[PDB]
Ligand binder design. Structure first.
Ligand SMILES: CC(=O)N[C@@H]1[C@@H](O)[C@H](O[C@@H]2O[C@H](CO)[C@@H](O)[C@H](O)[C@H]2NC(C)=O)[C@@H](CO)O[C@H]1O
Ligand code: NGO
Length: 499
């Protein structure tokens, strides 16, 4: 069918731009030249990151950026399009550091979207930056607009969309039109900020790239998988904040959509998006991490899963104890809590004391260091088999990942994703998706196909009775009901009739 999107972040800090070199990994660990022609062919999008919104309320580079060096770096990325006529070099505005609630630039995000005039100036600046530097689209990663700010955010996305469409016409770019994406929340707490208006958020986008990772971290009491596909009943559960969003739904409607507590998983986030009317599966992109999250002070018994831990949650990491044995990149980056897949492979291969274990419910690997009490949750080419099959079964738009520098030197994670979507000889028809917990919620946008006998006027229906009526299958919430389905509050729309 339609090719699945494969969207990889290229993140480069300002000091690495300003000192850019392709021949000294101690200055720039992952220069553009490491994205070989083979890797460029396996990507559909590279998200160059991160730009910001400045105090003038315009899209802008970090003001410390050497502009000549920035253009050189971007030009090296756009040169890769010679190897892949489908490849887009997007640019990403925001990210956690700039745009989180306490981030250095947060007020600029709030203010840029707040009024019609601000939105026009902001939208114009986005497209100007896109054209000036040669990017192929705009990606906005505000983490995250609050419920009160959502209407302005929506209007800003709509305005950027119109300007991008104008630019596509001006440049004759119908074969590769300029695109608009966002990085969206991948867990219900942040998602609840804008969930009620999800259809309006997604309408102007080519894709919403779900950040379906960081679902565990040092801010939680209990270690867990950070990107479990399905749930493990032995693992923690979470309050379903979506049931408190301003939806206007009834008790039965909320309960059917938002089981609580629930397992915080990739499947949960995807299904939460599909449950909403007007959110098409083809626009949902599943994010995956190319890094693991490491915890210390864990107990034994279950390989470090679901244990208390003593991992500092502060930023920056508060001391110089780099306790993730074998993680040389952690020493370089002064933080033992995150390890690239590239580094995790070496840690497993060296004499460092790790076991690689597998949770067959979550379909994800983890490392356990029994002697020191360490636990690492990460993803690999095996967990990507199940996630790729899920992407195909659920008819999602594709996959996104953070970030390209964390794949191994040979690009094995990217090559695996490309194989699972595109290789003619790859067969996952027999890949068993397991018995992990699925998110069972149903909403207006994901009604299952059902059959039931036609509703009969005058018949007295007991609680739980199912009838077909006017294109849908309905269930009584109590009994005895004689009203026509949809005419009052007694009937729940539970399914749709096949065409
Ligand atoms: C919002 C999301 O998808 N993930 C959030 C994390 O990005 C964030 O972790 C922080 O990310 C920064 C940007 O990469 C790092 O500089 C910072 O070290 C890191 N902090 C920690 C403790 O991991 C966390 C922070 O609470 O929130 C996630 O939700
Ligand atoms: C889409 C993307 N932007 C965010 C998000 O990924 O999580 C990353 C890893 O936690 C973080 O570094 C970044 O600021």
């Amino acid at each position: 069918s339609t090719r699945k999107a494969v969207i990889g972040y290229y993140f480069i800090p300002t000091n690495q731009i300003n000192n850019y070199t392709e021949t000294d990994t101690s200055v720039v660990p992952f220069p553009v030249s490491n994205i070989t022609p083979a890797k460029a062919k396996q990507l559909t999008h590279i998200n160059f990151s991160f730009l910001d919104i400045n105090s003038n309320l315009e899209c802008a580079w970090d003001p410390a950026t050497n502009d000549a060096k920035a253009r050189d770096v971007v030009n090296r990325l756009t040169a890769l399009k010679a190897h892949n006529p489908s490849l887009r070099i997007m640019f990403s505005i925001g990210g956690w550091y700039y745009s989180n609630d306490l981030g250095v630039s947060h007020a600029n995000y709030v203010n840029a979207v707040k009024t019609p005039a601000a939105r026009t100036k902001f939208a114009q600046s986005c497209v100007r930056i896109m054209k000036d530097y040669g990017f192929d689209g705009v990606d906005i990663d505000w983490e995250y607009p609050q419920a009160a700010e959502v209407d302005g955010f929506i209007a800003a996305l709509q305005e950027i969309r119109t300007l991008l469409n104008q630019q596509t016409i001006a440049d004759g770019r119908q074969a590769l039109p300029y695109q608009l994406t966002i990085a969206g929340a991948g867990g219900a707490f942040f998602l609840s900020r804008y969930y009620s208006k999800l259809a309006q958020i997604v309408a102007p986008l080519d894709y919403i790239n779900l950040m379906t990772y960081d679902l565990a971290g040092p801010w939680e009491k209990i270690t867990n998988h950070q990107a479990a596909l399905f749930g493990d009943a032995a693992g923690p559960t979470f309050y379903n904040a979506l049931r408190e969003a301003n939806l206007g739904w009834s008790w039965e409607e909320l309960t059917r959509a938002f089981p609580s507590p629930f397992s915080l998983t990739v499947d949960a986030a995807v299904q939460q998006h599909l449950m909403m009317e007007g959110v098409p599966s083809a626009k949902i992109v599943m994010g995956v991490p190319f890094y693991g999250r490491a915890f210390k002070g864990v107990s034994g018994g279950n390989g470090g899963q679901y244990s208390s831990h003593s991992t500092p949650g502060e930023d920056p990491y508060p001391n110089a104890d780099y306790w993730l044995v074998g993680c040389d990149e952690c020493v370089r980056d002064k933080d033992p809590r995150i390890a690239s897949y590239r580094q995790l492979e070496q840690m497993l291969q060296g004499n460092y004391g790790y076991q690689r274990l597998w949770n067959d419910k979550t379909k994800t690997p983890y490392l356990y260091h029994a002697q020191n009490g360490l636990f690492v949750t990460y993803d690999d080419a095996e967990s990507f088999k199940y996630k790729a099959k899920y992407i195909k079964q659920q008819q999602l738009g594709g996959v996104m990942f953070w970030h390209l520098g964390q794949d191994n030197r040979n690009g094995d994670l990217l090559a695996a994703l490309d194989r699972y979507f595109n290789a003619a000889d790859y067969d996952d028809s027999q890949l068993d998706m397991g018995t992990g917990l699925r998110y069972t919620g149903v909403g207006p946008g994901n009604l299952p196909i059902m059959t039931a006998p036609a509703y009969v006027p005058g018949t007295t229906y007991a609680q739980g009775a199912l009838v077909s009526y006017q294109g849908y299958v309905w269930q009584t919430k109590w009994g005895y009901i004689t009203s026509a389905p949809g005419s009052d509050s007694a009937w729940l729309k539970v399914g749709r009739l096949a065409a």
